Design a protein around this ligand. Structure first.
Ligand SMILES: *[C@@H]1O[C@H](CO)[C@@H](O[C@@H]2O[C@H](CO)[C@@H](O[C@@H]3O[C@H](CO)[C@@H](O)[C@H](O[C@H]4O[C@H](CO)[C@@H](O)[C@H](O)[C@@H]4O)[C@@H]3O)[C@H](O)[C@H]2NC(C)=O)[C@H](O)[C@H]1NC(C)=O
Ligand SMILES: *C/C=C(C)/C=C/C=C(C)/C=C/C1=C(C)CCCC1(C)C
Ligand SMILES: CCCCCCCCO[C@@H]1O[C@H](CO)[C@@H](O)[C@H](O)[C@H]1O
Ligand SMILES: CCCCCCCCO[C@@H]1O[C@H](CO)[C@@H](O)[C@H](O)[C@H]1O
Ligand SMILES: *C(=O)CCCCCCCCCCCCCCC
Ligand SMILES: *C(=O)CCCCCCCCCCCCCCC
Lengths: 11, 326
């Protein structure tokens, strides 16, 4: 789920 | 008997001494000293000096870095464009008029500067909403087999423009109106005068509900979930020091975004409401300026939070700012 945090600009 | 009315305006000063003049015709130096007009001008100068570079860079860097041109980023660019509507439509006009002591462009100008300033602020506003929806959709995955793609990002953007027109257009055509506010050097929605011929009463309710409450609820729900989802994951995966880090960073950022949103719009909503429910009370020019100082300053702080604190944009900016290198 970190992939999606990276995508979304939050991690 | 609190100010002075005329056809397209409301000056927050009693005309018992005969001194009040149309804020489209002559300096309002009885509302506030000239040095305070100059500080108003100094503040618009600061907002331009910071806001134009930050927001312009954001666009420029997107042109130079392929990796930034994804769909999840379109709404961030949309934000920066909106910040620029506020910079050129609002801030520059106001710098100019502040230094005359009044709204030299007259009523037509007052509609223009009000429409473009309001459109920008609203596109920014709804862009912060659409962003949270998109993140929630992508991370909480409230719909299985859904993939966020270009065609959606486009609707997201267009929806911000539709909603922002739904706020800025009506006062151009009879539902509320644009007039000079505060020190009368800028123009916005009439949310403080009851003006039956344009039905301000109901507009301010529509605004309060549709353009503050809905946004506030959508932002809180979407990000409440996001923080829930990520806290869940990390609890269920305490063996990943990374995932623990992620959870902390996401949560700090949500608190920042949520507090930031409030700082920007709570004062306008707080004031609209106090005034609506204290109709027999007198609100001077500097007090009507406070809501605006908070909202307009977001053309700087929003892109710090949303763009400069985003690792990708930041590295691209530093690269582009270091001539090609780093
Ligand atoms: C705040 O209060 C002030 C004081 O009331 C107010 O300013 C006044 O506006 C009136 C007009 O609506 C001005 O009247 C003019 O006086 C001069 C002579 O010195 C003449 O040029 C004009 O005469 C014509 O108009 C009259 C009818 O109004 C006729 O009697 C005459 O025959 C001519 O047709 C006109 O009288 C007045 O001078 C000013 N006074 C001051 C101190 O400025 C101001 O409008 C108020 N503010 C707001 C925002 O409304
Ligand atoms: C420079 C001045 C600007 C950007 C003013 C914009 C004002 C708004 C978009 C205000 C909207 C609201 C009301 C008028 C009252 C209820 C609360 C809001 C924020 C929805
Ligand atoms: C950065 C942009 C510069 C704007 C120049 C502002 C010019 C102000 O113009 C001033 O307005 C007075 C009214 O108060 C007039 O009496 C004078 O004609 C003039 O000095
Ligand atoms: C609308 C979104 C609401 C924000 C949810 C905030 C969650 C509060 O939760 C707290 O946040 C702290 C800051 O990182 C953590 O360190 C605490 O241990 C955590 O429980
Ligand atoms: C290469 O990457 C060069 C980096 C320097 C680019 C210039 C940065 C401009 C900074 C403006 C001043 C703002 C700081 C305000 C803090 C209060
Ligand atoms: C490569 O093309 C550019 C590298 C330039 C190095 C950055 C120099 C730092 C200057 C900071 C500017 C602060 C400006 C204050 C304005 C009021």
């Amino acid at each position: 789920i970190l992939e999606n945090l990276k995508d979304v600009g939050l991690f | 008997m609190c100010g002075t009315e005329g056809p397209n305006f409301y000056v927050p000063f009693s005309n018992k001494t005969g001194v009040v003049r149309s804020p489209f015709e002559a300096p309002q130096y009885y509302l506030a000293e000239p040095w305070q007009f100059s500080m108003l001008a100094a503040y618009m100068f600061l907002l331009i000096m910071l806001g134009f570079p930050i927001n312009f860079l954001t666009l420029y860097v997107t042109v130079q870095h392929k990796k930034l041109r994804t769909p999840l980023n379109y709404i961030l660019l949309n934000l920066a464009v909106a910040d620029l509507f506020m910079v050129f439509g609002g801030f520059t006009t106001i710098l100019y008029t502040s230094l005359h002591g009044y709204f030299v462009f007259g009523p037509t100008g007052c509609n223009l500067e009000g429409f473009f300033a309001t459109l920008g602020g609203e596109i920014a506003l709804w862009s912060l909403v659409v962003l949270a929806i998109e993140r929630y959709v992508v991370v909480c995955k409230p719909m299985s087999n859904f993939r966020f793609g270009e065609n959606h990002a486009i609707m997201g953007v267009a929806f911000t423009w539709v909603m922002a027109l739904a706020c800025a257009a009506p006062p151009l055509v009879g539902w509320s109106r644009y007039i000079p506010e505060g020190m009368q050097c800028s123009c916005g929605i009439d949310y403080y005068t009851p003006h039956e011929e344009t039905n301000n009463e109901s507009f301010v309710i529509y605004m309060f509900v549709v353009h503050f409450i809905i946004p506030l609820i959508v932002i809180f729900f979407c990000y409440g979930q996001l923080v829930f989802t990520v806290k869940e994951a990390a609890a269920q995966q305490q063996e990943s020091a990374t995932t623990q880090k992620a959870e902390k960073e996401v949560t700090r950022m949500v608190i920042i975004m949520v507090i930031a949103f409030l700082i920007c719009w709570l004062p306008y909503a707080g004031v609209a409401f106090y005034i609506f429910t204290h109709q027999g009370s007198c609100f001077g020019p500097i007090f009507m300026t406070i809501p605006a100082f908070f909202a307009k300053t977001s053309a700087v702080y929003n892109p710090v939070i949303y763009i400069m604190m985003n690792k990708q944009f930041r590295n691209c900016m530093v690269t582009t700012l270091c001539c090609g290198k780093n």
